[PDB]
Amino acid sequence: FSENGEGFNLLMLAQTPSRLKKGSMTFTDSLDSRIALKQLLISVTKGGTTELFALDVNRDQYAAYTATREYNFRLMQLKFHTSLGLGEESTTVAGAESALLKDLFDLGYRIELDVKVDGEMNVENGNGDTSLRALRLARVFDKEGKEIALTDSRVS
Amino acid sequence: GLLDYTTLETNSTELIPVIQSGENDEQFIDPSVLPAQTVKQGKDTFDTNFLKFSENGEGFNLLMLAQTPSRLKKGSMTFTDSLDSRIALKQLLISVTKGGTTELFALDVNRDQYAAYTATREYNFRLMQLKFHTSLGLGEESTTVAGAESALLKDLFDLGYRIELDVKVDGEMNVENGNGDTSLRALRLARVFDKEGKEIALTDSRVS
Amino acid sequence: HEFAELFYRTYIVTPDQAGFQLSIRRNLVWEGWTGEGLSGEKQEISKRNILQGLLDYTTLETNSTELIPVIQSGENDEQFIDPSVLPAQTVKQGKDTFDTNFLKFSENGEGFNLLMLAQTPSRLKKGSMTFTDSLDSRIALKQLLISVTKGGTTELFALDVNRDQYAAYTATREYNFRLMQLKFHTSLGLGEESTTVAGAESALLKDLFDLGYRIELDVKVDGEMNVENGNGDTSLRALRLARVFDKEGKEIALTDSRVSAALSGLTVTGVGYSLEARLTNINQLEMGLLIDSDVQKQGFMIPTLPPLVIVKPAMVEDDKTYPRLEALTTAYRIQQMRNNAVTTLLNRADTLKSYLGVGVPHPIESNLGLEGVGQYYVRPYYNEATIDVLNDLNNLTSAAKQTDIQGLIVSKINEMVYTADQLTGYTAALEAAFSGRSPKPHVAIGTDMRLPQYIQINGDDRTVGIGYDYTIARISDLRMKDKIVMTFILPNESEPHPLQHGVLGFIPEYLVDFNMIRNQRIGREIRLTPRYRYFNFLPIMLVINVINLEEAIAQRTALDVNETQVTPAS
Amino acid sequence: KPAMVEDDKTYPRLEALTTAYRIQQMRNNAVTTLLNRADTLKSYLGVGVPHPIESNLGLEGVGQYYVRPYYNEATIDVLNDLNNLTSAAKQTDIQGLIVSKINEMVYTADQLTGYTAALEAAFSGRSPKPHVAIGTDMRLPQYIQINGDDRTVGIGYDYTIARISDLRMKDKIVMTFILPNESEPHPLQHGVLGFIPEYLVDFNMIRNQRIGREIRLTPRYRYFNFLPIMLVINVINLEEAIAQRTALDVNETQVTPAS
């Protein structure tokens, strides 16, 4: 996430060695209208232990870039503003089960976080940026689908 | 009212933030940074101040903030009150700081490129959307608020130079129930301009 | 009313629309693709508007077909002169950087093949040079290089001889018959201020240069060039000192004492040269200039406004306490069209003053913080001038003071409008947008009830400057009290257009009349809910503040005659 | 243009190419050449000092066979060279100030170069009065309008005022001798434009293994100079003279003690 505010040029990072042999040019190309994030890598850390969750975000419809022609005739907008849940069967990238959330998962609770990510992309130029805006623990569910407050002693 | 402009000009259907101490005071920047400003709508006398940015926390509610004693006496807030189609950012307040001295300037972002909520729905059919992304700069004579000219820019100003700022502001509003928030995404110094309108390097001795 | 009408043309909108969209076409030009910078770079290349190119000259023009010699280290060094005499020079053509030196004069050996000699790095990727390309219909020398040696010190002079009378290649009929010919027997001069390549006067000729003398060298250069396969060779035929010119242009004898002293032991030799030849291909391997287009579109929303409420008991209608509906209508019309209009005008003026500085024209698409679509047609400009009538005026005698003040104010308005036209490039945009007609700018004048009696001229021909049309506005709001606003508008059309100062977004609202119940009371209420919003398009405005008028008229005016410093003090 | 569709926005029609051609050829190159002409004459000859006829054989142009070479420049300080009676008469007096200087320079150039003799010689049976051309920006040319003085560029003279938008000639007047009756290349007009039209072509280029259609327009022309004469006038601080009071700069010329 580029919180320094300086963007990236996507047509650079993705030039393959075949294209290098093919030549060196990325400026007559055009990106398709379809842009969406594959995965959000969120780090669950507590006391120095880090777990990585490879979450497939492509299957939430708010992760799809939408065209808002308000600056130029080729910019499109990204607004993924929802909650993702980490269930008991959530698996790490290496394939192991959760460890920091193991205490709640063995108690059958479900943890979901509100994700507020914003970005922009231009097809013609390749200019674009996407920066994290707001992420936080949100609420806790039980088996019966009854909300459990964050301030409850069993989960606080 | 044909000569003076105040006899006919009155507003009584405007939402304005209102302050009352220690009971709703977490949507307002602490008064130790800026004293409260007195504004009068209708016959009610009350104080207002800029709503604060919130990044990782809960947003604000405009309806609960904009409830004036005239509306108290008429009855408690109901659910049929509706927000208008046009909502805009009036003032964006920044502080230029160098050496411990704080100078605040009120940018009149009202009437800027995209300082007005545009109809952009992705979740609800009511969610109003704002994307205020533009280069907003300070001129070579732009006087600070509360009188006089700024001192921290005295050297650049006396040389005839101009500075520019990039502003990235995002915010969402729901005209159905009064829930929404605003966040600051990026706001930094970007470029410096000469009196002849030609960009010079940021590595120049005077500019640095 | 007239006043808000001049600065904002009314635009009616259907009630259902909640906002109207303004999409404009803009034509773009930029040089090449960005291509590789690391393996490429994010395209920071300035796509600059073509109308900007109407004003400055660096937007256009490129040299992309010149057959500039290019050195390859260790391959063709022997055609170029020895780099000991002169280090490599770098010139830019498009996106390439490479080193160039003047060619060596062929004496007896094989000549040079220019086409294979002119491989820029781009052309190498472009594919190996094959002979289906043909040279320029005319070729010539760019610069001629000689070395003035006196005692051992060498000085270089880059004699720019291009566009000489006798430096253009010509056709001939011998040997081959695609052959071009270069006969160059001409007198070259070395000016009394002429500077070397490094940018300094000739030390060996400083003494000669002091007495106001010029050196003329007769030069003889010949060579051949073929336009079929680029073969060509040239040789130094004859070059020597010939004669001397003076400041007043009469030949000075070579045996004269001054000349003989100045020309002791001076030897002049030729070293190098260059050719102005361009590959006039039939399909072109060059991108020349690229033309692109973007679309920019702005949003505009029309709010709701506080309602205007009537009260009247409803079994009988009154005409004495509440008149016909005209009262509500006129109250709404004044409240809309005057108070809000003046407020938005002054707010616009102060916003421009804050953002844009004073008297400085900013380039297109650079420092915008305002509204419009005119910024893509004209450079922004804002300026203000204060008039101290008491201290600035010219009057020999009384019974002419009115003419005096009107002359000063008319001169000031002329200067403002003229400088605005000259700097903004507004009239060029007006000409470009409208084809088949060339309208002159129309200037609007808004002010209080004072100045109209002085801006209407009684006794002089000029009023706003002949060649300009005007419309005077009179208004009684105290915010305009002793103030003048100025701008450019177009009164011949009634549609949203980029060159109009402003448009009044106006949605008609129909009067509603139905019984309403306040605190369980019954009466007929006539409710008017207005909606509108004053918009702006053009970011150009001129404002003049005139003060001390009363004092100037009532108090003794006095010729501020310039006592000018002829009695020793300066 | 990508060669699988056609447009009107991303495809600017032939009109856009025509406009680009018009700009590049008609204005910018001509102005560059004129300023280069001025600079090279300045360097070769110097200010105010002519040269004998047929004293140059390698100087650009051919019309050195008829008129002595001459180049000169001058400046006007409107701030200090302005006497005013009434602020309702100031503008006319400024215009007269500029016009008189124009006239005097024209007369001086004519007298030194002997232009009238050349015009009478090269044309048999005609005695045409010289024609002066006015190249200037778009701020001045409203300041050559007065009837305050009968002389506009001087009696016995016809003139034409030309505008231009380019900023490089800010408040600069360029003057020369032309001839409006001619339409052929002759050594008495300032110069001719060798112009030959060309037509555009559109065809599929496959370069570096890419697909696209390109439209090419080949302009071919050249600017040439004949007359080695030109006069340049500069106007400085025109705005200040209007801006502040400029009353009688009355020189109090010392019938007083100590002088």
Author numbering:
A (entry chain D): 132 to 287
B (entry chain Z): 80 to 287
C (entry chain Y): 28 to 597
D (entry chain c): 339 to 597
From the article:
The Klebsiella jumbo myophage ϕKp24 displays an unusually complex arrangement of tail fibers interacting with a host cell. We observe the tail fibers are branched and rearranged dramatically upon cell surface attachment. This complex configuration involves fourteen putative tail fibers with depolymerase activity that provide ϕKp24 with the ability to infect a broad panel of capsular polysaccharide (CPS) types of Klebsiella pneumoniae. In this study, we combine cryo-electron microscopy methods, protein structure prediction methods, molecular simulations, microbiological and machine learning approaches to explore the capsid, tail, and tail fibers of ϕKp24. We determine the structure of the capsid and tail at 4.1 Å and 3.0 Å resolution.
Each pentamer consists of five MCP monomers. In comparison with a gp372 in a hexamer, the N-terminal in the pentamer’s gp372 shows a different folding direction. In addition, gp372 in a pentamer changes the relative orientation of the triangular body and the hand compared to the MCP in a hexagon, which makes gp372 more curved in a pentamer. Overall, the MCP interaction regions in a pentamer are similar to those seen in the hexamer. However, the increased curvature of the pentamer alters the relative orientation between the triangular body and hand regions, leading to differential stabilizing contacts. Specifically, in the pentamer MCP, residues R501 and R583 in the triangular body interact with residues D448 and E442, respectively, in the triangular body of the clockwise neighbor. The interactions with the clockwise hand region are reduced overall, involving residues K380 and R558 interacting with residues E220 and D163, respectively. In contrast to the hexamer arrangement, the C-terminal loops in the pentamer do not appear to form a large, well-defined pore in the density map. Instead, they are disordered, perhaps owing to this different arrangement to the reduced space and greater steric hindrance between the MCPs in this region. Nevertheless, we do observe a small opening at the center of the pentamer that may be capable of solvent transport.
